[model samples]
Target: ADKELKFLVVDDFSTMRRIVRNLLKELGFNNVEEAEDGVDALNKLQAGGYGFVISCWNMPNMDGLELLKTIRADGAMSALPVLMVTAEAKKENIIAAAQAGASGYVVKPFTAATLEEKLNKIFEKLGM
Candidate 1:
């Protein structure tokens, strides 16, 4: 994808979202936005013009998986790439995310290299 592509970072914690946003900037992507939860993310997504999503699984309102499912079911944003960045590392959650159409998955406390690798893989897969 274009380095200038807009990204949405979704997490309940302000610091987590800020951390991800900073990571994205370090990776040469500065066009980013933040959402506090899935519901806010969904609303932002529905408003259009975002290229990718980095989301946390556990949240107060709608969770990441539910948001993923909703995005997958929506025609406009169905193909919108979503990368899960969460503490949830259970096999079931990983499997469910893949089944729900997530473009990539990263367990929390991940290194910058891992995030870069996964993002590269997803972009390569999509021919972006």
Candidate 2:
């Protein structure tokens, strides 16, 4: 695992951000960073060298879907991996995310094991 592979964890709650960031670090990804919302995530992404994005869907300014769309549409990082981490557990939501080019989706209150499984699944699917 590459510890320097940068990651952006986007969430409105600082506690959630902290949890995700810490989880990434525990999973051998120490170069993780945080963004308060999708807007902030996009801003940091533009300035950036992030390898992956783990975003929450229900933020105030710019939801995860919009952010994912922007990232996919961008020329520079069109191929970047995006994993959705949201509380939206609806089948339609998952399908929408999948159709919208999300690398993976994890519902909220997920355990570290679940996160790890999702990460591995995404990496394998994307050949990362």
Candidate 3:
């Protein structure tokens, strides 16, 4: 993946978003943006130029599953790689995202290696 590849980090909490944002920053991915929830995620996403989305499964205004589904139906960015983030025990929710067409996902409280590894998978999946 290109070093400048843009990423949208979505979460309902500012702290969590910052965690992912800075982790990505530390991972050498700096072109990152933050969104509070799904609607906000979609709104920013609609402005275009996003290469990946890291969104939380448990969020208000539209859960990650529905958001993923909408992205799949939105035509223009339908092939967008969205990796849902979920709690450790909610592996089923992760499965839901996968079934709903998520490019991939990570469990909450993940290590930098896991996040980097998952993003690489999506990049390779998309031939980026």
Candidate 4:
């Protein structure tokens, strides 16, 4: 991943957020920030300048699916990549995310390699 590419990690859990942040840093992406949930994420997103998003499925205020849809609907950040990092392992949840235009998806309790691979795959698909 590009060192300068900024990323937003959204999860209601502080521990998960910190873990993802550290993983991103270890992967050589130091330009990362966090949001407690989808609503907070959108607020920061509307402020501009985020290259990617790592979001959870279940959250208060707004869920990941809603956030994904909102991002896709937004004119300014419509092209922004969103990679779902969630515990929602239901087949329907995955399908819903795909339909919502998610750039990628990763189930929680995942390995760092999975995170790195998914990030690379999304970047590759986007030709970024």
The lDDT for every candidate, in the order shown, is 0.91, 0.88, 0.88, 0.91
CA RMSD (A), model 4: 0.9
lDDT (0-100) at residue 36 of candidate 2? Answer: 90
Whole-model alpha-carbon lDDT for candidate 4: 0.91
TM-scores of all candidate predictions against the true structure: 0.96, 0.95, 0.94, 0.97
Question: What's model 2's overall lDDT?
Answer: 0.88
Give the alpha carbon lDDT tens digit for every residue of 1-128 in model 3: 88887999988999999999988988899999999888999999999999888888888889888889999999899998898888764667767777899998777899788899998888898999
Error of 3 at 91 (Å): 4.5
lDDT of 1 by residue, 1-128 (tens): 69898999999999999889888888999999999999999989988999999999888879999999999999998998999987859898889999999998899887677889999999999898
- At residue 106, candidate 3 shows an lDDT of 79
Model 4 agreement with the true structure over 1-128: per-residue lDDT tens digits = 57779999999999999999988888889999899989999999988889999999989999999999999999999989999877758888889999999999898887778889999999999998
Residue pairs in steric clash, candidate 1?
1-128
Clashes of 4: 0
Clash number by candidate, in order: 1, 0, 0, 0
Name the better of 2 and 3 by lDDT: 3
User: How well does candidate 2 match the true structure in TM-score terms?
Assistant: 0.95
Q: For candidate 4, what is the TM-score?
A: 0.97
